[PDB]
Amino acid sequence: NCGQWGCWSSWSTCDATYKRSRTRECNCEGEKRQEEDCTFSIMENNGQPCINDDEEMKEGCPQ
Amino acid sequence: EILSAVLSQEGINILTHAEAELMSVVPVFYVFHYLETGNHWNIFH
């Protein structure tokens, strides 16, 4: 069985703005704060969709 | 067509929870407008 970073903190409540933060303690090299975005703009919930790789613009009586 | 009309979890997640008070309160107007237009309130108990 033979400084180091500590454990991250709990994600703070999502503020009115996108800014949500998480902090790590050096209790060393690295970052002490990480600020990410959060808004939960997707209210609708239908199902997990499957996506393609790439698409194109363009492929009875006519028009 | 009657494809879909979906809106949920907005009233429970963000209803009441400095400069972003506008950003917070604006979507409530549109949610109320959608609820009045769709005429669907029986989804909740």
UniProtKB/Swiss-Prot annotation, chain A:
Annotated compartments: Secreted; Target cell membrane
Domain of life: Eukaryota
Disulfide bonds: 14-38, 26-28
Residues linked to a glycan: 5, 8, 11
Record-annotated TSP type-1 domain positions: 3-39
Family: Belongs to the complement C6/C7/C8/C9 family.
Clinical note on disease: Complement component 6 deficiency: A rare defect of the complement classical pathway associated with susceptibility to severe recurrent infections, predominantly by Neisseria gonorrhoeae or Neisseria meningitidis.
Function: Component of the membrane attack complex (MAC), a multiprotein complex activated by the complement cascade, which inserts into a target cell membrane and forms a pore, leading to target cell membrane rupture and cell lysis. The MAC is initiated by proteolytic cleavage of C5 into complement C5b in response to the classical, alternative, lectin and GZMK complement pathways. The complement pathways consist in a cascade of proteins that leads to phagocytosis and breakdown of pathogens and signaling that strengthens the adaptive immune system.
Protein's name in the database: Complement component C6
Annotated source species: Homo sapiens
Section of the entire sequence shown: 551 to 646 of 934
UniProtKB/Swiss-Prot annotation, chain B:
Recorded superkingdom: Eukaryota
Activity regulation behaviour: Membrane attack complex (MAC) assembly is inhibited by CD59, thereby protecting self-cells from damage during complement activation. MAC assembly is also inhibited by clusterin (CLU) chaperones that inhibit polymerization of C9.
Recorded coiled-coil stretches: none
Ranges annotated as spanning the membrane: none
Cell location: Secreted; Target cell membrane
Quaternary structure note: Complement C5b is composed of complement C5b and complement C5 beta chains that are associated via disulfide bonds. Component of the membrane attack complex (MAC), composed of complement C5b, C6, C7, C8A, C8B, C8G and multiple copies of the pore-forming subunit C9. Interacts with the tick complement inhibitors OmCI, RaCI1 and CirpT1. Interacts with cobra venom factor (CVF).
Function: Component of the membrane attack complex (MAC), a multiprotein complex activated by the complement cascade, which inserts into a target cell membrane and forms a pore, leading to target cell membrane rupture and cell lysis. Complement C5b is generated following cleavage by C5 convertase and initiates formation of the MAC complex: C5b binds sequentially C6, C7, C8 and multiple copies of the pore-forming subunit C9.
Name under which the protein is recorded: Complement C5b
Organism expressing this protein natively: Homo sapiens
Full-protein residues shown: 986 to 1035 of 1676
